[PDB]
Amino acid sequence: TVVVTTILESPYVMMKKNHEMLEGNERYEGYCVDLAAEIAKHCGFKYKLTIVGDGKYGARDADTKIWNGMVGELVYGKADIAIAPLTITLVREEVIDFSKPFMSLGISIMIKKGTPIESAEDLSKQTEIAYGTLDSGSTKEFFRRSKIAVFDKMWTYMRSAEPSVFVRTTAEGVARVRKSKGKYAYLLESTMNEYIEQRKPCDTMKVGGNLDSKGYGIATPKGSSLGNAVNLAVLKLNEQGLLDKLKNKWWYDKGEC
Template sequence: MSTKEKDDSLVVDNGSYQYHMLFDNHTRLIVTIFDEPFMMLKKIPNDTLTERNIPRGTILDPSRVEGFCVDLAYAVCHDRLKLPYKFLIETKYGKEVEKGVWDGMIGALVNREADLAIASLTINGEREKAVDFSKPFIDLGISIMISKPEKQKPGVFSFMDPLSKQIWMWVIVSYLFVSGILFLISRFSSYEWYFENEWDLIPRNKFSLHNALFFSFAAFMHQGVDLLPRSISGRVVTSAWWFFSLILVSSYTANLAAFLTVEKLVPPIATVEELAKQTDILYGTLKGGSTMAFFNKSTLTTFKIMWNFMQQHKDDVFVSSNSEGIEKVRGSKGKFAFLLESTLNEYVNERAPCDTMRIGENIDSKGYGIATPLGSDLREALNIAVLQLTENEFLERLKQRWYYERSQCTNSGSKDSKQTTPLNLANVAGMFYVLIIGLGSAMVIAFIEFLFKAKLDSKRLNQNIREVMRRNLRISITGIDFDEKLHKEEYLPLKQQQLVTSSPPSSRNIHRNERTPTIANKFNLTKINNDKDDIFRGHKLNHVFHV
């Protein structure tokens, strides 16, 4: 028979489910279990009631408890289903004792002692045969917990840490490739060839191979140089390289401060595969739990290896409770890893003394669901309610509230929780794409310039365009075609050089010493300048003429 205490919020249950419904014909009983942060007893001053001394079968008013599942029950039963409810406390999740006989929360539903179960109750195949589950209200999986390793101080070459080795390699390749493209374009473009003065026999090109390498390096280091390309194609290459350098250097600088000031945590293992391959670190699970059953039944090679390893060390790795496993991790100094559900792993990592951490991704995928007896009239309504709460992100806000807003490691662990990681190729792939597009565009423009120059030369010299292109290509590779230029009288530098060398020394001295030219000399200079303009058809700037 049920007895009601002086406090209306607490009822000790010794009777049947039918009696509870007589007690309040419209009240639904929600069976649950104390499990932080899902279901916790509210702390009231001068109250001697604790979670440990509350017996199984106790009925609690919602005002006496708090937690993730308490807020979820209020949102589902009160806000959407408009049902009054109370909580029925159980001490076990439930397993099949014998054929068709269950204990714990599953047993309460099978025996119709409760209307629904809202707790950290995992959905699995065996339980689905005994009760109905709603859609998962929280997703989880098996995860790995280890103790936090000691922090490592920055090393001598920590300045290279902001970028991964892959990016450093591609930056060097890009630097050499850009320098080579700039050198080739400057050779093919007629705008990069020039005569430094009127008497030069050989045209000059500033972008030799070593100058191209120096220019690219100086641009990457944001240093100014006297070398600047004149052709459109050369300027396109330079612009793309400047953009690439700006983004890369800015990203590197932004990440460098964090690497030099934050002491990094380097765990001994990073994935479940690494854990399975080594033997120095022991690992185990909760004895008789769903995690242990998962490894026992798994057919994957990695999990088989892990299960065999745990069987060999079963006296040291299997624990009787999650709290025992967590304490074992804290006292092992990195020599024990505990396999547990990710929800508990995340929550413990946010609680003092903040000395544990989660590594790797979840090993499997499952979820917590709201359970009801088979054929319950609440099943469809509960499914709709859970879907609506998922869509409006109410469940995500609940997790944020009970996991992270109440974190005890916010100040001490904020830096640890936000570990700086090197930028990889995926983070900065865009600037490489821009550089590749710029180099490709520059090569196309350089080819168009080459064709355009060949067409102009073929018209001016009245020659076949293929011959002109062949000659210009030879000139671009070797410099100047002397054999051809020596036979052309209108080639100004050779003509002037021949005039100077053929004149007697006395006349050359006279010309060198005279400051004021005569009328004849002025006429000759004017004629020479006119001839020069006809030949070069270019601009004269500071005594520098383009070919």
């Protein structure tokens, strides 16, 4: 039985309230739960859905040289495959294999409805409305390393802004937009932005084009017997229009706005 590691992140994987009365993969619901089923069916394997032990995605601690999250669970043999909103990156790709992307995404802007901002350039041009990113991670690093004039102006502002514009968690950045009366705009992944845009109170809005391009891929260890088949299944699902049906289902058909 293939051990699938994944993470509790809405709308990808969610516990079904009455989960104790249920068993196996039946305790979970979400985009990645439906995805796991399509992939297992098309790869010819039976599987068990497990939630990553430390609730993390996958990062190598520079001091201990130890991978945490779903990446660590693959690299240390705790799970066979990771089917979750796991971004395809160069550091992760050096220790594990990724399938072709099953979903695209990129840095975007979240505003509370009514704030006069339509782009990153609009943000870069003013001071009334504060803006920031998660306190540690790719989005913060993106701005820190950017050579693009607008994104550099944005970095010069954010690193020195007081009170701090950086937030400890994604939930805080979202709550901060909602509670700041339009004086705070949040920089996060487009997938999370558009998901929140379809959740009550329906007071948030995604604006502007994406600042970069990333993708979530399915992960397997180097030399995995699963690697080849899962990659072909991802391509086949996209071509049959299934990934789009799946995203629409979990983001819009189940929308509240």
